[PDB]
Write a protein that binds this ligand. Structure first.
Ligand SMILES: Nc1nc(=O)n([C@@H]2CS[C@H](COP(=O)(O)OP(=O)(O)OP(=O)(O)O)O2)cc1F
Ligand SMILES: [Ca+2]
Ligand SMILES: [Ca+2]
Ligand SMILES: [Ca+2]
Ligand SMILES: [Ca+2]
Ligand SMILES: [Ca+2]
Ligand SMILES: [Ca+2]
Ligand SMILES: [Ca+2]
Length: 333
DNA sequence: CGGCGGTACTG
DNA sequence: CAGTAC
DNA sequence: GCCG
């Protein structure tokens, strides 16, 4: 299936390195190049053939060929030494490249330097203490019980609540980095005020152990990012994301929350090429205009009762969640 | 060359 | 606003 | 990094 496996691995390493150093557009370019190589019907055999692939240009071709001809890749040996520390610190939830760079510049190089001397935000403290647990992907079966726990707690308040696990789970993966639960109610109204009760119920049984992003001052709270742990001996703490949306938003919210991230970006960039805007709330025939410039013209939602509607309105055929790794990847079936 | 998804918290 | 996240 |  992947005919250029030897080449992708090396480019990933390189990609990773730009990512932790904060060079994101460059990291973006690599990611796309890499998926394109993985998609290709055959080993790449010439520079020309490589350049012909969308997402692969001159610099990437040079490296691709260099690998194929000479077998390894020079540049992997000039990767700055800070990189693995930087990846280490960016693996703390709530710490990104800026924080990892600050930490590096004040001399920390291990998790101990962080624990014992770093200034940590509230979120980082939690990410640090669950560092290992949050690094481990969970099996699909743990995700199912996490989701059921949320669904039962919800359906105890209102049995008409719809709860669905999205993310990699809904794309059919075997393991999940974190569970993503989307809650709605078909009557258009009774999704309102749910979070207060749902979080309280989930806390009482001891299932939620820490909160990361949860603005509970707001009765119209839309999201919860926190930490759960299933009951029973030896269970790990897992990342849990819950969104509560109005039914009219369901299709767009389902699409967003199913992902993948690259898939959603490409869908969104497509919508904009066609004078629309795609968000987790809606698809909108929205457009700019600002007296010698551009701006906000919030341009009215197109109703999309299902995900198929969103695909149709963008000129695309429905894509099964399992085939939503990348938009530009066409699986046959 | 400039743009690269669109949005929600936290501090 | 900057940082980080989804 | 690549693309229009
Ligand atoms: N940057 C992102 N934009 C997105 O639109 N998403 C969307 C919203 S949540 C949905 C799933 O993303 P996750 O980050 O939980 O990633 P995942 O479920 O695909 O994979 P994993 O098993 O959780 O590692 O994708 C995620 C992003 F990280
Ligand atoms: Ca190309
Ligand atoms: Ca991080
Ligand atoms: Ca369910
Ligand atoms: Ca996930
Ligand atoms: Ca998630
Ligand atoms: Ca809070
Ligand atoms: Ca440039």
């Amino acid at each position: 299936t992947n005919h250029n496996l030897h080449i992708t691995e090396k480019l990933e390493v390189l990609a990773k390195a730009y990512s932790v150093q904060g060079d994101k557009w460059r990291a973006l370019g690599y990611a796309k190049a890499i998926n394109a190589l993985k998609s290709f019907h055959k080993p790449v055999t010439s520079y020309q053939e490589a350049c012909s692939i969308p997402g692969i240009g001159k610099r990437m071709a040079e490296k691709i060929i260099e690998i194929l001809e000479s077998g390894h890749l020079r540049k992997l040996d000039h990767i700055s030494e800070s990189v693995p520390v930087l990846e280490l610190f960016s693996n703390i939830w709530g710490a990104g490249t800026k924080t990892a760079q600050m930490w590096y510049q004040q001399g920390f190089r291990s998790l101990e330097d962080i624990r014992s001397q770093a200034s940590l935000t509230t979120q980082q403290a939690i990410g640090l203490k669950h560092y290992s647990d949050f690094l481990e992907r969970m099996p699909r079966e743990e995700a199912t019980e996490i989701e059921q726990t949320v669904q039962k707690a919800a359906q105890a308040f209102n049995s008409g609540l719809l709860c669905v696990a999205c993310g990699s789970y809904r794309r059919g993966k075997a393991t999940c980095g974190d569970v993503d639960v989307l809650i709605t109610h078909p009557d258009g109204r009774s999704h309102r005020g749910i979070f207060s009760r749902l979080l309280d119920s989930l806390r009482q049984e001891g299932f939620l152990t820490d909160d990361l992003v949860s603005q509970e001052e707001n009765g119209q709270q839309q999201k919860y990012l926190g930490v759960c742990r299933l009951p029973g001996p030896g269970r790990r703490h897992r990342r849990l994301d819950i969104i509560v949306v109005p039914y009219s938003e369901f299709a767009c919210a389902l699409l967003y929350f199913t992902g993948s991230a690259h898939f959603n970006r490409s869908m969104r960039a497509l919508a904009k090429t066609k004078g629309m805007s795609l968000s987790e709330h809606a698809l909108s025939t929205a457009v700019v205009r600002n007296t010698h410039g551009c701006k906000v013209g919030p341009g009215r939602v197109l109703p999309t009762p299902t995900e198929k509607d969103v695909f149709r309105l963008l000129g695309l055929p429905y894509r099964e969640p399992a085939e939503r790794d990348w938009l530009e990847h066409h699986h046959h079936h």
